Amino acid sequence: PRVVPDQRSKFENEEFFRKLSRECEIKYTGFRDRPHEERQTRFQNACRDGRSEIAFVATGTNLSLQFFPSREYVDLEREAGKVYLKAPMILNGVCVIWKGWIDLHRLDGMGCLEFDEERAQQEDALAQ
Amino acid sequence: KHSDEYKIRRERNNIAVRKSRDKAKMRNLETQHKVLELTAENERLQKKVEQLSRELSTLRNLF
Amino acid sequence: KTVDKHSDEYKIRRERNNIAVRKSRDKAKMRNLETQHKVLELTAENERLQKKVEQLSRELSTLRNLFKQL
Amino acid sequence: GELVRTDSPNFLCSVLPTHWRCNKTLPIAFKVVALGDVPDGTLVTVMAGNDENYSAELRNATAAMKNQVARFNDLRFVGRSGRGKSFTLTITVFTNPPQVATYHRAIKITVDGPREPRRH
DNA sequence: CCGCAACCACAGAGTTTGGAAATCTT
DNA sequence: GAAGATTTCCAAACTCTGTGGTTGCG
Ligand SMILES: [Au+]
Ligand SMILES: [Au+]
Ligand SMILES: [Au+]
C-alpha cells in the first residue's frame, strides 16, 4: 500500500514527523566536489529541471525533491534573493508536501513537512 | 636502440599486439555471454523438468 | 613519491610485483580455460535435459490417453 | 539476502551490516523491494544522513527497479557516520509522486570498519 | 595502566593496462 | 625469409585489506 491506515495520527504523534513538521535548517546536498560557484550554478540549473536534493541538517534526514505531479510549484521573485519550493511526497506512506526556501547564494534555507490532506484522503480511498 | 628502424619497427609491432589483445578480449567476453545463455536455457529446462515431473506425478496418483 | 631505479627496495618491490603478476595472469588463464570447459559441460547438460523433457512429455501424453480413452 | 521492514509500509530492503568500512564493498548486494506495484525502469537512490553527518558520500547509490526489486551494483558508503553513531538511509523510489522510505540506524561507517581486537 | 572505538599511515598482495621481447603462423 | 599475430616479460598505477601507531573516554 502506498500509505498506512491513517496518516493523520502518525504524522501528528510520530516524533520523526513532528520534529520535521516545524521549519528547520536545511542545506543543498548537490555536488560538493566543485567550489561553491559551480554548485549554485548546478542547483539553480537543477531548479530548471525541477529536481533538487536536500536534507534536514538537524536530524540528518536526506531527501530528493521532485517539483511536479498547498500546491506543487516553485517560486522566484517572492523574494529575489532566494528560491521558494514545494514538493509532493510520500515519506513512509504518508502523502505529504515539502515546502521551504533556500538562499541561492548560501545554498541554505529552511523547510517544513506539510502533510497534504487532499492527497492523503485520495490515496486512502484509492488504496485497498 | 634509437635507430630509425626502431622508432618504427617497435611501434609497428605494438599496433599488431594491441589488436591481437583486443581481439582475444572480445573472444572471451563473447564466451562468457555464451555461458550465461546456456545457463539460462539450463535453468529453464531444469525447472521445466521438475514441472513435468510433478505434472506427471500428480497424474500418476489420479490413476 | 620519487625513487631511484637502482635502489634496493625498488628492485625488491619491483621483483615481488612481477612475481604476483606472473601468478595473477597464470590464474586468469585457468579461469578462461574453465569458462570454456563449462560451455561444453553445459551444452551437454542442456541437450541431455532436452531429451529428458522431450521424453517425459511424450510419456505424460500417451499416459493421459489411456486414462481418458478407456 | 535477508530483507527487513523500512519505515514505509510499502517497501522492504536488505539488512546492512551493523558496522562497515568506508569505501569497502558490501558483504551482500543491497536490494530494495516493492510490495505494491512499481513499473520497471523506475529509478531508486539512497542517501544517508546523521545528526553529525548530514549527507554522506555514496558510491553507486542509483538503481533501477525491475520486477518490483531494486538491486544495487556495489553500493559503497564513503563518509564516516560518527563514533558510536549510525546513519539513517533514505531510499527514494522515483515514481509520480516519489515515495520515500527511511531506515533509521541502518549502518555504521567508520574508517577501519570492524577489526579483530588489537592484540596488545 | 588497560582496552575500546576512532583516525591516519601504509605495507604488501592482487589487478589492470600497455610497451618490450621472444616466438609462432602463414 | 619474414610481416603480422600470438605469447611471454616487465613496469607503473590503482584497488583491497590488514597491521600498527596514536588518541580521548571510561
Ligand atoms: Au533557480
Ligand atoms: Au516553510
Ligand atoms: Au573511506
Of the candidates C52, C59, C50, C55, the residue with the CA atom closest to the CA atom of residue B60: C59
CA distance D21 to B32: 32
Q: Name the closest ligand to CA A24.
A: 2
Interface contact D62, partner A, CB < 8 A: no
Residue C60, domain extent? 1-70
Alpha carbon A59 to its chain centroid, in Å, reads 14
Burial D6-33 (b: 16+ CB within 10 A, else e): bbbbbbbbbebbeebbbeeebeeebbbb
CATH number at residue A92: 2.40.250.10
Of the candidates A9, A43, A7, A23, the residue with the CA atom closest to the CA atom of residue A98: A23
Instruction: Tell me which H or E stretch contains D54.
Output: none
Orientation angle between helical segments C9-68 and B4-61, nearest 10 degrees:
30
Distance B23 CA to F23 C1' (A): 55
Q: What are phi and psi of B18, to 5 degrees?
A: -40, -50
Interface contact A29, partner D, CB < 8 A: yes
CA distance D45 to D64: 9
Q: In this structure, which amino acid lies at residue B16?
A: A
Cα of A45 from ligand 1 centre, angstroms: 6
Q: How many CA atoms lie within 13 A of D88 on its CB side?
A: 23
How many domains does chain A contain in total? 1
How many domains does chain C contain in total? 1
Neighbours of chain D (3+ CB pairs under 8 A): A
| Cα A127 to Cα A16, A93, D12, D92, D94, distances in angstroms | 24, 11, 19, 20, 19
B3 SS3 class: coil
CA distance D6 to D11: 6
Residue A88 contacts by C-beta under 8 Å, 6 or more apart in sequence?
A: A66, A69, A72, A95, A96, A97, A98, A116, A119, D97, D98
Interface contact A58, partner D, CB < 8 A: yes
Resolution (A): 3.0
Q: What are phi and psi of C31, to 5 degrees?
A: -70, -45
Q: Name the closest ligand to CA A51.
A: 1
Alpha carbon D103 to its chain centroid, in Å, reads 8
Which residues of chain A neighbour D42 with C-beta distances below 8 Å? Answer: none
Q: A98: which DSSP letter?
A: E
CATH number at residue C23: 1.20.5.170
Which of C39, C45, C50 comes nearest B34 by C-beta?
Answer: C39
Domain boundaries, given as residue ranges, for chain D: 1-120
| Cα B10 to Cα A84, B6, B14, C50, D16, distances in angstroms | 64, 5, 6, 53, 53
Q: D118: which DSSP letter?
A: P
Of the candidates A82, A65, A78, A71, the residue with the CA atom closest to the CA atom of residue A29: A65
Domain topology for D1-120? Immunoglobulin-like (2.60.40)
Distance B24 CA to E24 C1' (A): 16
CB D45 within 8 A of CB D94: yes
* Total length of chain B: 63
Distance C21 CA to F1 C1' (A): 35
- Give me D90's grid cell: 533514505
D2 is an annotated ligand-binding site residue: no
Q: In this structure, which amino acid lies at residue A105?
A: H
CB A13 within 8 A of CB A39: no
Of the candidates B4, A30, B22, the residue with the CA atom closest to the CA atom of residue D55: A30
